[PDB]
Design an enzyme around this catalytic site. Structure first.
Site, PDB file in Angstrom:
ATOM      1  N   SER A   1      75.399  30.544  60.093  1.00 54.42           N
ATOM      2  CA  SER A   1      75.381  29.574  59.002  1.00 54.42           C
ATOM      3  C   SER A   1      76.731  29.489  58.268  1.00 54.42           C
ATOM      4  CB  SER A   1      74.221  29.848  58.062  1.00 54.42           C
ATOM      5  OG  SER A   1      73.965  28.696  57.286  1.00 54.42           O
TER       6      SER A   1
ATOM      7  N   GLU B   1      65.886  24.476  62.967  1.00 50.39           N
ATOM      8  CA  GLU B   1      66.888  24.730  61.939  1.00 50.39           C
ATOM      9  C   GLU B   1      66.479  24.318  60.513  1.00 50.39           C
ATOM     10  OE1 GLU B   1      69.596  26.538  62.069  1.00 50.39           O
ATOM     11  OE2 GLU B   1      70.048  26.716  64.195  1.00 50.39           O
TER      12      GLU B   1
ATOM     13  N   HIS C   1      65.820  28.758  60.854  1.00 50.43           N
ATOM     14  CA  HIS C   1      67.205  29.093  60.541  1.00 50.43           C
ATOM     15  C   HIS C   1      67.319  30.556  60.111  1.00 50.43           C
ATOM     16  CE1 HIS C   1      71.298  28.093  59.197  1.00 50.43           C
ATOM     17  NE2 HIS C   1      71.031  28.711  58.059  1.00 50.43           N
TER      18      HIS C   1
END
Ligand SMILES: *[C@@H]1O[C@H](CO)[C@@H](O)[C@H](O)[C@H]1NC(C)=O
Lengths: 535, 530
Positions: free
Chosen positions: A203, A327, A440
């Protein structure tokens, strides 16, 4: 020294450390934790570049994780493992520029490939001390040297008055860089090969890795790079100098404040005070609203990442990149009305169009129209299960998947060796609801090998998967190629090319090749949508 | 004197011919006048009822074809000639044809009325593919087909004028439908059960009769094959028609009254010479003279009209073919020919789009190219070629046909929808054209039942099956065989479930969503983008 374990005293340029022999599932590892790499960025030093750490005397005790950089603490779900696993796990303080090193025990004889972790947290949060970033398994089972640093997040790391002396911007990235420099100079003292440094991150950490690929002073400090679920390009990882100046000014007013005076005022403000206001800078309803991110300052980033990934020469570069299956699911529960961790989050069509405005806040009415159009299943345009899943895809595709697909494409074209994956295994231990799929951030625990700790309750097959993944990542660190040079029963992982667009699936089954990374949809976000944002 | 071939219609007596069909004889009344010849001072004008005639009028042969452009792109090529006028061209052309079972039906028979296509610039009732003999014989149908005026003669309007009011070709059609209400009983036809069917412009015409109130009392059901009143090509605004009219006049050296009087003085072939120069605009559908939104016949644009109409007591069968767009490519788009495989370059494709969608602004073109590119094989010439066909089919036919089927169902009609996927074994266009515009007609009409034509034995069964679908729909509003328990039943098209069927050699397959995502693109997005 005298009576100490001789395997746990090392010297670095700053002086003497004493480490800790930690227990790992299949043997011991060495950990040197909380080594300072910078002068504490406090008081007059707030908002400013990091200065190298002045040498200390005696033996520094490097047996515990240090303070976590001052950050906002998530309190959406008190007591909830799913959110607390990411919350700070050490005291919060501006004095937080420390890194950690894990190495084999005894520290290896010949010089070993190094892996550097840059944590995520949308640039507003994160810590190298979190459990899911434990280097012990990678150290023990792959004989890897693993290093991870704290870097300043939120206002302290990224608030910028671009052009100024006192708050130049990007200091969080500069903290990371000084940690890389520290690795070059000192990692050998631990048996690390400073001629073999692979960066990996997830990320905002992945975005960070991407920016180091893109920033020249930093290109000489590593050789390979892994970007998990993040990119330097895309809607959330950067801000224009003007925009960053607006936000800094705005935050200043909120706390009660010529650039010198403003920052001088800011610096006289308590840390918590800035954290309490860092969310008010954009009333602007927006999931990946975070006000303080890397600024395109014409220094660290000489130009926007999109510009730089289009026109740079990545001939000498090996990247590994990828995404998880779902995600965007995670993000919906943080301010898209209708979504919750506690029900199945079936939304109405109205709630979908409403969410599309929040997920894509930079979108004209015609644009939102386009997204909705593209993501509606016209066979069942009213079906709440599909809409729920659409909303996830929208947020997921816009912020992660298509930015990654773009990144892989440009890079491959500009001469890089790119390998691409999609992670598909939901953790049997996951505490988020079924509907969120593989959210995610939930591949990290697998790459780091967490499932090898018997006490963590992972299935046996997950323990084999973890090992498989760890092999991929370290092979990549070692060779620039995730595949095994020996073992050739296992299906090969082909490079991603412009022509074939091949990537692999990571799940409990053996490697399967697929072609096209959400190809049609990413063509929508990357090629068409921008032009629709010409008024 | 066969008394079966003798009929007294309101205008007088007619003598038919007895025709030979595979499994028996059919009565036939070809070339019956339904209107005064629209010649001289009557060019551009509404049709008047034909005056009565002394004696026995000879209706044993096909009359003249309305004055029309003749296709010369591929001279002597069967693929193209079969559409070309197969009789003498003449402005004297308002004649219809009736086919009936021999002996002529003992009680009133449902009537099917065919309206030929040809983009409102061509076509004839007398073409081989509209031969009504098989439907008459095998299914016992009264089958009617009329000529109506096309091109400038049928469609040239100076809206608001008395002397060229527009839509006269449609009024021709209406009059033939009036003639049927009034005379078809005399042939054993049932005027209480008239079903209209047509393809392409014939489909659009059928649709315009649905949308026009006087027509409504003249038929009970409708079939629209590969065409619609909505869409890019079927209609023009009063303003734009007047522009195209004056531009055509100026092109042949010519106040509304004085302008028309001048046009009236010109040989037919002079107007056809310049028919195609009114839109130089290098599109495919640069045909200039089409039905006009006139506030009269068409009280408002079809889109408006289909959107707000009430279709309670209406049954409609609509459909498309697998490859609506392939045929047209070879007429305008560079890179496409019947003689090679037309594997095109990407650049060719982007140029292709600015032609197929001549409406398109830079951005809307971008959007179309974006939508239709296979981003996994973005350069593959096979895909780009097939995409180009798809762009043209979808934009002009499939999406219009979906738009209409949805609106008719939403506002109360009963809709049955198909897609036609069978390529005639005897087709003479190349393989890359798939199942092209027009190539289902021959099956609906029963052509494979004629052994002299070399259609496979499977195809002959397939045609029998389609003839049953159409006549069952004609008889009942329902294409389904009411003595066929075993099913695959053909479900009504509803906006909710969106079911249609595949018409091909394998038995009926029910599929849902007629190009659902792509037509959402055409019907919801692209409009807004303009
Ligand atoms: C689930 O909880 C959310 C957030 O509080 C609520 O708004 C939503 O209505 C719930 N979903 C349903 C319809 O059960």
């Amino acid at each position: 020294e005298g009576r100490e374990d001789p395997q746990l005293l090392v010297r670095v340029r700053g002086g003497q450390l004493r480490g800790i022999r930690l227990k790992a599932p299949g043997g011991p590892v060495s950990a040197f934790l909380g080594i300072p790499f910078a002068e504490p960025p406090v008081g007059s030093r707030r908002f400013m570049p990091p200065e190298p750490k002045r040498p200390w005397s005696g033996v520094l005790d490097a047996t515990t994780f240090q303070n976590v950089c001052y950050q906002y603490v998530d309190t959406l779900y008190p007591g909830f493992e799913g959110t607390e696993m990411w919350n700070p796990n050490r005291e919060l303080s501006e004095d937080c520029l420390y890194l950690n090193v894990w190495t084999p025990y005894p520290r290896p004889a010949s010089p070993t490939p190094v892996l550097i972790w840059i944590y995520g947290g949308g640039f507003y949060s994160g810590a190298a001390s979190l459990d899911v970033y434990d280097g012990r398994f990678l150290a023990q089972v792959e004989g890897a040297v693993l290093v991870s640093m704290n870097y300043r997040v939120g206002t302290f790391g990224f608030l910028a008055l671009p052009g100024s002396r006192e708050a130049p911007g990007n200091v969080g990235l500069l903290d990371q860089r000084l940690a890389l420099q520290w690795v070059q100079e000192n990692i050998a003292a631990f048996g690390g090969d400073p001629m073999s440094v692979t960066l990996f991150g997830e990320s905002a950490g992945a975005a960070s890795v991407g920016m180091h690929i893109l920033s020249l002073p930093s290109r000489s400090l590593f050789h390979r790079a892994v970007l998990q679920s993040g990119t330097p390009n895309g809607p959330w990882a950067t801000v224009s100098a003007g925009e960053a100046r607006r936000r800094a000014t705005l935050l200043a007013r909120l706390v009660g404040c010529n650039d010198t005076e403003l920052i001088a005022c800011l610096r006289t403000r308590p840390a918590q005070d800035l954290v309490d206001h860092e969310w008010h800078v954009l009333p602007q309803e927006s999931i990946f609203r975070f006000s303080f991110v890397p600024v395109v300052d014409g220094d660290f980033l000489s130009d926007t990442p999109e510009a730089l990934i289009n026109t740079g020469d990545f001939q000498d570069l090996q990247v590994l990149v990828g995404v998880v299956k779902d995600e965007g699911s995670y993000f919906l529960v943080y301010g898209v009305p209708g979504f919750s961790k506690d029900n199945e989050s079936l939304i109405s069509r109205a709630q979908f169009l409403a969410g599309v405005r929040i997920g894509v806040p930079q979108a004209s009415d015609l644009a939102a129209e386009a997204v909705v159009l593209h993501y509606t299943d016209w066979l069942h345009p009213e079906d709440p299960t599909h809409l729920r899943d659409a909303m996830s895809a929208v947020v997921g595709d816009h912020n992660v998947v298509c930015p990654v697909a773009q990144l892989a494409g440009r890079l491959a074209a500009q001469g890089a060796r790119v390998y691409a994956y999609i992670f598909e295994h939901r953790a049997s231990t996951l505490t988020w609801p079924l509907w969120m799929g593989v959210p995610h951030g939930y591949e990290i625990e697998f790459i780091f090998g967490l499932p090898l700790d018997p006490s963590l309750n992972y299935t046996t097959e997950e323990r084999i998967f973890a090992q498989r993944l760890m092999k991929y990542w370290t092979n990549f660190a070692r060779t620039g190629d995730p595949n095994d040079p020996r073992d050739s029963k296992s299906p090969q992982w082909p490079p991603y090319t412009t022509a074939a667009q091949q990537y692999v699936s990571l799940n409990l089954k053996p490697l399967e090749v697929r072609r096209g990374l959400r190809a049609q949809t990413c063509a929508f976000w990357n090629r068409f949508l921008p032009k629709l944002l010409s008024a």
